[PDB]
Amino acid sequence: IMAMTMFCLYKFDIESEQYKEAVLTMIGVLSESSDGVPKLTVDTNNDLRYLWDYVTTKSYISALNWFKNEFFVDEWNIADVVANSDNNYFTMASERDVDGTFKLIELAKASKESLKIIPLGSIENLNYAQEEISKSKIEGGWILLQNIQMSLSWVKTYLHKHVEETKAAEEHEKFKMFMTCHLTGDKLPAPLLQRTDRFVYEDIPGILDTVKDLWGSQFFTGKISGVWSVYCTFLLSWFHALITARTRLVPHGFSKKYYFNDCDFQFASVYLENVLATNSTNNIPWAQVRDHIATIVYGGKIDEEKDLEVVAKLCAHVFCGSDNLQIVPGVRIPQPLLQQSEEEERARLTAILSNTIEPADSLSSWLQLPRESILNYERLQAKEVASSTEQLLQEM
Amino acid sequence: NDDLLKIIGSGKHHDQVSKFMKKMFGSIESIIFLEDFITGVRSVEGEVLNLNEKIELKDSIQAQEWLNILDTEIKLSVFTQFRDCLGQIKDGTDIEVVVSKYIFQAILLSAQVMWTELVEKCLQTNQFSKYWKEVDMKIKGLLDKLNKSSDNVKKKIEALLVEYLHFNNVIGQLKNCSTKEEARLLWAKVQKFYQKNDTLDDLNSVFISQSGYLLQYKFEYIGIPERLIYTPLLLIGFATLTDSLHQKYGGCFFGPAGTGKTETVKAFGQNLGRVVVVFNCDDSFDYQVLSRLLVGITQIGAWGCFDEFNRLDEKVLSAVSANIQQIQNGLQVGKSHITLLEEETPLSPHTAVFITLNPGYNGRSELPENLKKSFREFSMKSPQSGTIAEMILQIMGFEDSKSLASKIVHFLELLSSKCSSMNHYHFGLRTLKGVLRNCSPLISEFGEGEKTVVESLKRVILPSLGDTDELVFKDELSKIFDSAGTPLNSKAIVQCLKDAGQRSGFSMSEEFLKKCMQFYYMQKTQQALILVGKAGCGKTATWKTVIDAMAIFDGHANVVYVIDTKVLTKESLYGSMLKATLEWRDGLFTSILRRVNDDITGTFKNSRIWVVFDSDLDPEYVEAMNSVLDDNKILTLPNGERLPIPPNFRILFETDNLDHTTPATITRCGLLWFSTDVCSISSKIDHLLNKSYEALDNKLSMFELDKLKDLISDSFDMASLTNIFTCSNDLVHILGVRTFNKLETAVQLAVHLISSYRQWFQNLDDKSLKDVITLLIKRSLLYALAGDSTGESQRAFIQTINTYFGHDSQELSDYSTIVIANDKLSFSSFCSEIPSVSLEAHEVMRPDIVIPTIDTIKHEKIFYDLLNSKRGIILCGPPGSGKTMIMNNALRNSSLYDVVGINFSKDTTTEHILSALHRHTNYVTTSKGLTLLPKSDIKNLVLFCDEINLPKLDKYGSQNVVLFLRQLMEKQGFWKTPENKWVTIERIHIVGACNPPTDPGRIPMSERFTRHAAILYLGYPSGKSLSQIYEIYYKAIFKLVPEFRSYTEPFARASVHLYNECKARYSTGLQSHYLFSPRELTRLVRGVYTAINTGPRQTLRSLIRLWAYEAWRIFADRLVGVKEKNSFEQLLYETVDKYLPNQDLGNISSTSLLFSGLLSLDFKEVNKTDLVNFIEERFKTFCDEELEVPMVIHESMVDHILRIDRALKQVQGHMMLIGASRTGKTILTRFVAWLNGLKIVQPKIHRHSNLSDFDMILKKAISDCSLKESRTCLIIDESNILETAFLERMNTLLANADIPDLFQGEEYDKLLNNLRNKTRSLGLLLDTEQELYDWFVGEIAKNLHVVFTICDPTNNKSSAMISSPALFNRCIINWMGDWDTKTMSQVANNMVDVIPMEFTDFTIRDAVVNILIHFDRNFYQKMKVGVNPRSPGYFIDGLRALVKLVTAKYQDLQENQRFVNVGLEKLNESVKSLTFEKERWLNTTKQFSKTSQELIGNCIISSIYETYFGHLNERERADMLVILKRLLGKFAVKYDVNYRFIDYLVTLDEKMKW
Ligand SMILES: Nc1ncnc2c1ncn2[C@@H]1O[C@H](COP(=O)(O)OP(=O)(O)OP(=O)(O)O)[C@@H](O)[C@H]1O
């Protein structure tokens, strides 16, 4: 929105009047205000002639990013921003789908180390927290305050005064405090917010990448279950990464934004350990595995009947499957071999991830929803950016 | 603490602990002893549990010690009763045997364990059918046992039935499975109750499996609770709860209210032998108590449910939510001890927290963030009904329960898709539970077959359907299932219904029989009945007919109580409690029940009691009775009690709409929708006639009666009238009422008009007789259909009547009348004869003066005729149309009726009506009607309710004051608000005037009230009658100037011309207050008289100017701006030239004609020079004597002083001044009031002022005006009106001249006493109570004078002032909205009168003032937006800044010029080498003249910065400065080009300090 706006804020004063109505009749096409073909002159404008080519090719995401490239700016990486920034405080909000907690780990590792993750949980965590805060500034270590919004009542009393009083934090050793927020969620005090630097973690992982990230930790748990189980834990890895991928695509996709957690995976895997623990190793237990995953574990938060069918139809494909599953078009998962090596099978199932590379059309090929729905969605988020910019121009 | 102390204290007794157990256990109510020994405990349900070991007690034993043993033994005792029982059933024992000896909790668990065991093996063998019948038989066996059982064990069987149905249902489902895998899937979803045949610790022996997860049954007593029917949905909820608990997480379900989320958590507990503690959150619930209970739950290891957690207050919610985290975080980790409420308390791992989340207006609620990773949220949904339906059918006596449940649901579901979407239609399960509930008595009549279901569908669903949907029901009912041909109770009721209606007057039509049948069948089943329909549908007729037919058929009498629901308050009706003394008095609804319940002294047992609510029904009132509408059938008091209602006592609701009521309220009651009127137009008439004839029998001989009823029948036939009523619709009706309800108006009139001429029907010609009849009937028919019509339409309809009636029959004329002789019986038809009026000068304005017109007589006759009928009248029409006078003069004349005037305001109460009646009415306690309320004198009384469409309506939208009148009109008696008894009003009439409700201020009236009124729309007259009427007005006042008696007509024609033109030129399209009527004319004519009656003998040039003055004050003072104001100047000129052609007139503008009685003893035109000087000498005096404030007396102000003066002189003097701000409107008012010798009262309001404060301010000012003869002038500013009511009080003080409320009850009696004292002191005793009050009010009207000062009429609160009718009509609106350029210059000049200045280029003073005006004109023109709300203020303060700044700068310029002159004398004394440069210092000396040139214009800029700039932007200031500098450039004033506001007024010492 700020791209398209600032582009028109510059070029309307700088370029021709014929330029003005041409680009505006284009921004009108991206929005549902109007549809037209702009005024066309041989060699008259070439950058503008290149833009309409994006809009006429029904390619929406491309035409929206056009205005970003036209700024000719290095779009600053949270690291660069932090490095430039000259304050010991930062609040980075983000959507509930992701958390930049793990981005901060690699940000600290690559420069200055000193990573300290601090959950604000109960009295103990806030109480330990306030102790680790006063000591880290003297030490100069980095600190993170995970999900403050929940512990907020405390913020207005202890943190609001504490951060305000600490003008000696400038005097104190190189130290940097970070706080994670959620944009959809409890509203932070404005005065504390204005004092502290702000970032939005907008970095969304691909399906395959999230599968690899789910499966990655799973080896840390040890070994307590069958070799066969690791196959079901692999199945769930794909499943969870497939519904999370669907969560963002709405309305086309899911009816509302639903949030699914690492808690949802945990409650699902717990049920899986339990079904394999209470049944024989025969594959056929599969029937009530789907029902319980699709209606209690994940279908719990779902309230709309439309969407409850979608979670079920995902379980239909991810869980029931004899000999070959074929989660995605390219990748087939075969059921455990007779050799029954549990160490081999981990490595085999990791290898199947390393073999595949996520296609261009992933959201339509992998999430079995149609291509025409994805375009419908691309069109709508285009319309939202284009609208809000026109609104902004006329307001000033 | 307090309860606990009672237990430690009550130890001696022991038995007194049983009270407190109910709390600390939840299941049990009281404990059983053998005194030394505890034999057992009994539950809140009534079930008796006996322990294994009776616990021994001694006196010196502690409660804590003995009770702790009981908790342990109570659980053990349940295991014992469980194993004992389980073992029995295992040994092939019929369940009917077991029930009689084992507690429910035990038997339930035993069933579950054996069931589970028996089905577990049955999955392997697939022997389902063998086990199924087996189970099915136990079900039937239990059912028949129940019918013959003791109420206590009746609970136990029913509770078990819920379970056995579950058993068989699951087995049947299992029989049906395609394969064995299918069966193992279904079985996994179910709650399977296992026992360990392995092990010790028996309390821990029973466990429960579901979805693979296990959960140990704790052995707590549950008693015998109401067990929820098992649904798939219920199991899924159980399954989510078990899935959360298994992983040590909290259970949480969100969803819409009525989805049973807490009931689930209660049940999920029970299934596992746990009594869940439910916290109803935010029912004004303390945090301190909850914090205690949370510690107890973590110690005792119980389950807590937060019932509607969402509803907590943010401070509480934070605190609670944080605590809950401790518990759930303690569990997930498993910490042995956790800290909460800042103390170390231990945590049982059996503990769980459950949260139910009702949705807000915004959405389905959420858990606080911290709780999100501690709980598991789930979505409760209403149960798909089919499953509930089947079980319910199973319990009653099934037949085929599966087919009915599928079929009923399909049909209900089908109706929903196939009927119209109508508001009150509910085809939700609530509805099928109701069909099913209604089914049980029905089964008794017929069968446990579909046919009984079919009938119950049409018993419930059909009475609420409307004609289109009524077939859809019938079409799809037969489409889904066909049952039978013939109905029971078909003949017997029907002849009892026909016989009741023949007696009542009614006609048994298709529909009237139908809705009578629908009703009869419903009272049977339903105890609360609703009747919904249009006003005049037939409801009162339906129920009054059916109820009457039941006393014929049963032999049971009825006792009906018809109460208007919304006339009385919730406190007047249910029971009102007083906050401090807590004194409880009965009410109305509750007090009539105490006759039946508390003391059935006479016969109530064999009687049927019906309490009818005739008024509109709303949530607040039904919610206060919802418990009677519930399955409870008991009344719950606000404080003190529950009163149970018998089966005789039925509550009916007749109303016109439902919009307000909740779907929950409908579905508890039986709803009877009246799609259309029960009865035919004709049939209505028929009944109406006969109803009218019965009244006459009491006052007319049978011979007379027999003959007159014969006449009516042969004169009017239905065939003719049918077209007449049809044509009635093709007509524009003011105050619209439907044809059908207008009928009573015809027949009641018609019969009275014929009973009028009864004597002349003895000897008159039989052909001629018919002509008298037909004429009357054609007349009465006209006003009843077209009376509320334009009359332009009446005339048109008159021909329409004539058309459709027989051609030969006496035709109707506009003014057609029947006439008989003064001294001899005669007969002839003549119309329009008028008595001729001559009135003296003094008579001219009087609240009771009528100059009769062809039309005044026409209306006054019809108006009087309707009252003879005694039908209520609504005179609807424009303001000044004469609706009040026509009503008043027709009755001020006759001996029969006596009028009583009530004015209604936006918020008037039903008590004000009563208090106004009490003044002219006397209650008599005659045993004939019990209490009655006739008039205080023998002959008939008429309430005149003026502005009847003014009182406002409940937020629901229901005006009670109107419903009260409706009560009086229809019921003829009302219920006493405090004393609670029926008083039947005798011989009292209701008449009302209202404005068209298309007019602003006006409220739409309920058809249920206007149905009992005859409506006559009276409009404005002619423009040629108006000319004629005011001729007679001028004729009367020109008795005082007989030399111009020939001038009355062109004055009357001119006045009317001026009126017609003002009304045309200045409309409500330009300004809202531009509203003219013949009241203006009357204002003008009287305004003219008062000038004459107190003026010098008059020349023709005088009188036209006298007339012109009043013309200005009446028509043009209200005019805004100048384009319109000048338009009137030209109009006034145009009118005199057209009607009074003279060359003797002068300047007719208001500024040039100034008339006053301040200078002369006689009201005369005064000299401008003579007046200004007179004001000047009196203002100094007023300035000296009163508050010291100096001002400039200017041309506008003199004109305005006279305007206020005239206002404050007239009997009723109300002027509202519209002056922007600082115009001086408040100061002039104080002045002119002081000249007139008025006490100036100004309400001392403030932010923390109550209505009571203002009430006091008002009351005093009123009491002083009458009982002290004070003569006060009340100045009310727009700021003083803090609420709606404050302005309403001001209205009551102008529409009437008293505020009723201030003096009521005892304070009425004290006023009344004091009134008699002063009246006699003055020397007049007044015969009656009415004679007294009218002195009081009249005294106020002439001594209290209200002036309003509103600044921005654009403001919505100040708009409401001008809007208010009371204020608009009785105030003189006056406009001062802006200072004109001339008045600005006048004021500017006198402020810069002080002359520091010296000669400049070009006048110097003249230039300065012209700049400031041109700056103020440019400031508001550039900066301010919006249309002319704001005016000269900064201008005054900008001039005041300049004066202070020039004086400060010129005295400092002359001070520095004196500092260089003193240095000039000192250097000349000395004269060496450098000092002659110092002498040269004439550059500075030369410089001074240039410095002084610019200081006047520099002060201009500095003053403008201080005043105009303070609130302007960086750029806004700079830009105005340029416009100021270029204004300084046009005018020959010099300014500094390099000028800086900071450096010019800030000093470096101060700039540093800041
Ligand atoms: N069968 C009938 N024959 C003749 N007239 C009838 C018949 N039924 C009803 N009426 C007329 O209609 C009127 C019915 O009164 P009712 O109070 O039922 O109307 P309503 O719809 O309840 O009005 P509201 O809603 O304002 O109470 C009666 O006065 C009567 O004149």
Ligand SMILES: [Mg+2]
């Ligand atoms: Mg009625």
